[PDB]
Amino acid sequence: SHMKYSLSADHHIFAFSKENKPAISVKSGDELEVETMDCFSNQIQSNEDKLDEMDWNRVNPATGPIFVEGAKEGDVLKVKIKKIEVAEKGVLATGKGLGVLGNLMEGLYSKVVDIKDGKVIFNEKLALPVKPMIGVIGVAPKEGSINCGTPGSHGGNMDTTLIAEGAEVYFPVFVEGALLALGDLHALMGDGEVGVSGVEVAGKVLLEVEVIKGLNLKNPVVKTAEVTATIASAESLDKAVEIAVHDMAELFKKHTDLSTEGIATLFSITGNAQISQVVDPLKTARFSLPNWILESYGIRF
Amino acid sequence: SHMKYSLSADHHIFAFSKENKPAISVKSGDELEVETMDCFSNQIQSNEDKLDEMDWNRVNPATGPIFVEGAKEGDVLKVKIKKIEVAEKGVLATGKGLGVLGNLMEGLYSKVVDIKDGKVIFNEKLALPVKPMIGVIGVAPKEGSINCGTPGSHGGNMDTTLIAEGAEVYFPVFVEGALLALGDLHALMGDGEVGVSGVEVAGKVLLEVEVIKGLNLKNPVVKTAEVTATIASAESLDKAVEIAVHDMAELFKKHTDLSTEGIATLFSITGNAQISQVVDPLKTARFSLPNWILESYGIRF
Ligand SMILES: [Ca+2]
Ligand SMILES: [Ca+2]
Ligand SMILES: [Ca+2]
Ligand SMILES: [Zn+2]
Ligand SMILES: [Zn+2]
């Protein structure tokens, strides 16, 4: 299938749920240009008396859900991120009790910054080149309902910098049609997101979807032109690292002839545990390996 | 001063302690070529019979300590890593209960590998370009002895991939003459070190020492050609990351007029919380910023 649709940000959700009716159905191989609201549903723009006294129930709108025909529970949905465009301004936020330095601050803070000629004008001294990424993306979990802001095995709020143009994200599918949704673009974000926010922007994501049938995943996987990382989320970084490393060990166990000791020592010396974010109600980490090692071992998604 | 000394591996310690007598006294500006034995005092030189049933209290011998004239409690010692040479063989170790995948393995594993042509020969199919780094490097703590295998504010077994040629590590000074010692070189290791070990090798480090006055650090900092990262260790990765971020936030607070929220939001978008190791008695993490950001705010240790 080769169709292309545009889905506007008027179709959106707040919690990833098997019960959300689909905004649109497409087929494996189809493309979508998905428009998004920023993390705040665009409530903060007037920069001025735009205080974070927003609605708050309107945070993390994810555009979707998209129903992908052929996707069944146990399959994988592969999402190719081809293009991220971002708006010409963004919003930074932080404050008492928010992120790692929440203990040093009182009150709430927001600043709207300009993005101009591909740079975030943080202040008069730093113009910081954009690295657009998608903070919230995932499929419906098999059961119940999780706020767009809590990451899990189905993706969701992973705030992972590798999900950027050129990346492919693989989710395990828990329900018929997968139900993909995405929002919370950042013009720029550092690993850990230790202030609580990135440069929060509205924008548009050209992506493509494919259904994979032969492949069992327990958690999301992102693959860029150079590395492949398993992503996991848990109540502590330590446990989230453990889960991501084990998920990658399992892919080796299932797709290669390498002994466990082989696995553990290879990972020790060529894999990198890294951090995506530390400031959501679960923390998110990842274990990354270079593509050519996987390829050598015959691991192909 | 511009003397150059060579310090051989027969001068070494097993714990960082203010009580260990100096192997040698040097002055600020002097260089040393420092020989190390591996993490195993060289007790595994071959396979077959050479397995983990070594002397074990002879693990992580650090060469040193070096008394650096002029260094006083409260100063900072800067150690420029100029060259690292590694031996032509190294050892990989893992096994039951070791590192993140300990729960998958039975007994104890080691493999001795050839290092040749600039590559770890991991096995018949895979050769991996070397990236030498120093795993254990530190000064004496203020008070109680700390075994070589544990990291802390004095440094020690931080297993940080950034500590390589071209880097500078800055340590807070706890005792007169600082008492620097180093060892546990790795021909290659990935962040997290999740199998338990690096490519463990002996070798030789060309370094230079300088005493810095009027800089307050609470924990070490590494500066490479590209980034400057605070390093910290704790019983969880979550705390370690929190300490690293705070120590960086305090450098900014005390050396700039950026507000706390300026700091927090800047860190959120341009700083990277990163992992050094999760398998030692404490985990070590880091927080890294691009050098030109510190440079703009006139931050130079
Ligand atoms: Ca987010
Ligand atoms: Ca070590
Ligand atoms: Ca200040
Ligand atoms: Zn966001
Ligand atoms: Zn080591």
Side-chain angles (χ1 to χ4, degrees), chain A residues 72-85:
Chain A
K72 307 211 194 247
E73 167 179 19
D75 296 337
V76 159
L77 181 69
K78 174 184 141 150
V79 186
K80 174 36 166 227
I81 304 307
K82 300 184 190 169
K83 197 172 201 139
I84 300 162
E85 295 177 295

Side-chain angles (χ1 to χ4, degrees), chain A residues 103 190-191 195 197 237-238 268 272-273, chain B residues 103 190-191 197 237-238 246 268 273:
Chain A
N103 67 321
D191 266 353
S197 94
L237 290 178
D238 307 66
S268 217
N272 293 290
Chain B
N103 63 325
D191 273 340
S197 85
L237 219 35
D238 284 323
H246 289 262
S268 218

Side-chain angles (χ1 to χ4, degrees), chain B residues 39 60 135-136 148-149 157-159 184 186 189 193 196 200 280:
Chain B
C39 178
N60 297 122
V136 162
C148 282
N157 190 17
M158 303 184 277
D159 288 339
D184 181 42
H186 298 150
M189 186 198 79
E193 193 173 28
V196 99
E200 301 300 336
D280 300 324

Side-chain angles (χ1 to χ4, degrees), chain A residues 151-225:
Chain A
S153 279
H154 64 282
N157 199 195
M158 297 186 288
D159 289 341
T160 291
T161 39
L162 298 188
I163 307 174
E165 275 183 8
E168 301 176 316
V169 192
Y170 298 75
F171 296 101
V173 173
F174 298 94
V175 325
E176 184 83 29
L179 304 184
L180 170 68
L182 51 146
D184 187 32
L185 301 181
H186 297 153
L188 184 55
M189 197 198 79
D191 266 353
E193 196 182 21
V194 305
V196 103
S197 94
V199 186
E200 302 287 350
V201 295
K204 273 211 313 196
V205 169
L206 180 64
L207 54 82
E208 177 194 311
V209 298
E210 291 174 16
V211 174
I212 308 309
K213 296 278 178 199
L215 178 61
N216 302 138
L217 290 178
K218 279 331 170 65
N219 263 310
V221 177
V222 173
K223 172 187 171 164
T224 66

Side-chain angles (χ1 to χ4, degrees), chain A residues 9 11-16 20 36-43 54-64 134-138 146-151 156-159 181-186 193 196-198 200-201 279-281:
Chain A
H11 295 269
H12 52 80
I13 59 174
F14 285 112
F16 282 69
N20 288 322
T36 54
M37 314 199 63
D38 64 35
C39 186
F40 310 111
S41 303
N42 305 341
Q43 295 179 87
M54 294 162 51
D55 192 325
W56 283 117
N57 283 335
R58 303 175 50 217
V59 314
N60 287 319
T63 304
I134 296 165
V136 165
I137 180 165
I146 11 53
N147 260 140
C148 289
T150 302
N157 199 195
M158 297 186 288
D159 289 341
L182 51 146
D184 187 32
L185 301 181
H186 297 153
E193 196 182 21
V196 103
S197 94
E200 302 287 350
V201 295
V279 297
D280 308 329

Side-chain angles (χ1 to χ4, degrees), chain B residues 78-81 162-170 220-231 289 291 294-295 299-301:
Chain B
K78 164 182 150 173
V79 180
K80 183 178 297 67
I81 308 309
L162 302 185
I163 304 181
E165 293 190 346
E168 281 166 16
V169 192
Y170 291 80
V221 166
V222 49
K223 171 178 171 191
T224 67
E226 308 299 330
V227 296
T228 287
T230 39
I231 306 293
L289 287 152
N291 296 335
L294 298 250
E295 181 46 22
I299 304 190
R300 37 186 152 253
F301 323 117

Side-chain angles (χ1 to χ4, degrees), chain A residues 258-277:
Chain A
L258 209 204
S259 76
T260 312
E261 285 75 12
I263 292 160
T265 56
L266 183 56
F267 276 14
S268 217
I269 64 167
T270 60
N272 293 290
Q274 311 176 149
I275 293 164
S276 290
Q277 58 74 22

